[PDB]
């Protein structure tokens, strides 16, 4: 037996999950399983849905699961997605006086709370003697943060591609700093405990397939650009710029150093009084037989 249903969460931003969904790669591989793709605006949204059973497999950044674990979610890390530091950014309105990270002190900074942008921001700010309490957070999902930025209500926005490329290409934004040199973890695939326990091998095979979907970003450059352009709405030039910011990042098993990295992030968040619990990553880590 393979399960009857896989309701799997994705974010449109993760170009490789868009393509797998478009090329119906899971469906091709698992013909006896109803594959249902459910889109979320970011990670924390996605994790809250895994928590209540709306999906049971989904991809997010490194922070969403830590926010979920701390609130009491019972998830499994089942796959790790390598970081793409150039695609994680702090943007400012191109008109703005701000040119260095130091200039962020006392400014309003939009970002998805609990998202990878929240950790990019803490860690960028740290290299300049700033912390979360030197800046004002505007906790806003990407579309709502975009609207506030276009309206002049934010001083800076921590956000990922496609928005970075979109706003820098159209003149809306300057890059203030990206995620290079912070030793970012990356992201994860999360699962419900029951589903990954019941259907381990299937969950591994799901990863095998999504892994090959990431491969299309480089092995099908010209085709990826069209489909993505077509699917997102974005111009091809922008989709091309987003592919330039992304080395391969194919989902594969959690290595030892990644687990420790995620624990170190958990510690740092707790230490900075941004999580109420100390989160233990390791008991939630899973690998198939």
**Residue spans per domain, the chain:** 1-83+184-214+249-289, 84-183, 215-248
Query: Solved how?
Result: X-ray
What do you get for the CA distance between the two ends of the chain, in Å? 16
Spatial CA neighbour of 61 closest among 209, 244, 190: 190
Integer Cα distance of 27 and 23 in angstroms:
9
Spatial CA neighbour of 132 closest among 275, 282, 239: 275
Contact assessment for residue 59 and residue 11, using Cβ atoms and an 8 Å cutoff: yes
Spatial CA neighbour of 46 closest among 78, 8, 1: 8
How far CA 59 is from CA of 88, 130, 248, in Å, comes to 16, 30, 16
For the chain, the C-alpha Rg in angstroms (whole number) is: 18
Which phi and psi (to 5°) does residue 126 adopt?
-55, -35
Residue 131, both tokens: 């912390």
Residue 277, both tokens: 């619990």
Residue 10: how many other CB atoms lie within 10 Å: 22
Spatial CA neighbour of 84 closest among 190, 193, 165, 191: 165
Count Cβ atoms within 10 A of the Cβ of residue 208 and give its class: 0-12 exposed, 13-18 middle, 19 or more buried.
middle
Domain 215-248 has CATH 6.10.10.20: yes
Strand order in the sheet with 75-81: 34-39, 5-10, 57-61, 187-192, 75-81
Spatial CA neighbour of 213 closest among 249, 182, 253, 184: 249
* 1-83+184-214+249-289: CATH superfamily: Periplasmic binding protein-like II (3.40.190.10)
Domain range 84-183, its CATH number among 3.40.190.10, 3.40.1740.10, 3.30.450.20, 3.40.50.11540:
3.40.190.10
Q: Do the bridges between strand 156-160 and strand 108-111 make them parallel or antiparallel, or are there none, so unpaired? A: parallel
H or E segment and range at residue 95: none
Integer Cα distance of 122 and 274 in angstroms:
10
Please tell me if the domain spanning 1-83+184-214+249-289 has the same topology as the one spanning 215-248. Answer: no
E strand spans, 94-209: 108-111, 136-139, 156-160, 173-178, 187-192
């Amino acid at each position: 037996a393979e399960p009857a249903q896989l309701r799997i969460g994705y974010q449109k931003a993760v170009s490789s999950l868009v393509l797998a969904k478009q090329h119906r790669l899971l469906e091709q591989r698992f013909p006896r399983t109803k594959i249902t793709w459910v889109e979320f605006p970011a990670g924390p949204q996605l994790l809250e849905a895994l928590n209540v059973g709306s999906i049971d497999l989904g991809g997010a950044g490194d922070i969403p699961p830590l926010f979920a674990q701390a609130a009491g979610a019972d998830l499994l890390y089942v796959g790790w997605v390598p970081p793409t530091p150039k695609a994680e950014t702090i943007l400012v309105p191109s008109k703005s006086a701000l040119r260095t990270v130091a200039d962020l002190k006392g400014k309003r900074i939009a970002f998805q709370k609990g998202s990878s942008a929240h950790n990019l921001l803490l860690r960028v700010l740290a290299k300049s003697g700033l912390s979360m309490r030197d800046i004002t957070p505007l906790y806003l999902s990407p579309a709502n943060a975009r609207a506030a930025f276009a309206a002049g209500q934010v001083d800076a926005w921590a956000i990922w591609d496609p928005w970075y490329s979109a706003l820098t290409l159209d003149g809306s934004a300057r890059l203030l700093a990206n995620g290079e040199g912070l030793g970012l973890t990356g992201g994860f695939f999360l699962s419900s405990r029951r589903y990954a326990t019941a259907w381990g091998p299937f969950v591994q095979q799901v990863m095998g397939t999504l892994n090959q979907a990431d491969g299309l970003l480089e092995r099908d450059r010209a085709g990826s650009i069209k489909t993505l352009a077509q699917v997102s709405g974005l111009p091809p030039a922008v989709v091309e710029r987003t592919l330039a910011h992304r080395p391969p990042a194919s989902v594969q098993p959690l290595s030892a150093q990644v687990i420790k990295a995620q624990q170190a992030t958990a510690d740092l968040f707790y230490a900075q009084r941004l999580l109420p619990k100390r989160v233990l990553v390791a008991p939630a880590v899973w690998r198939a037989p």
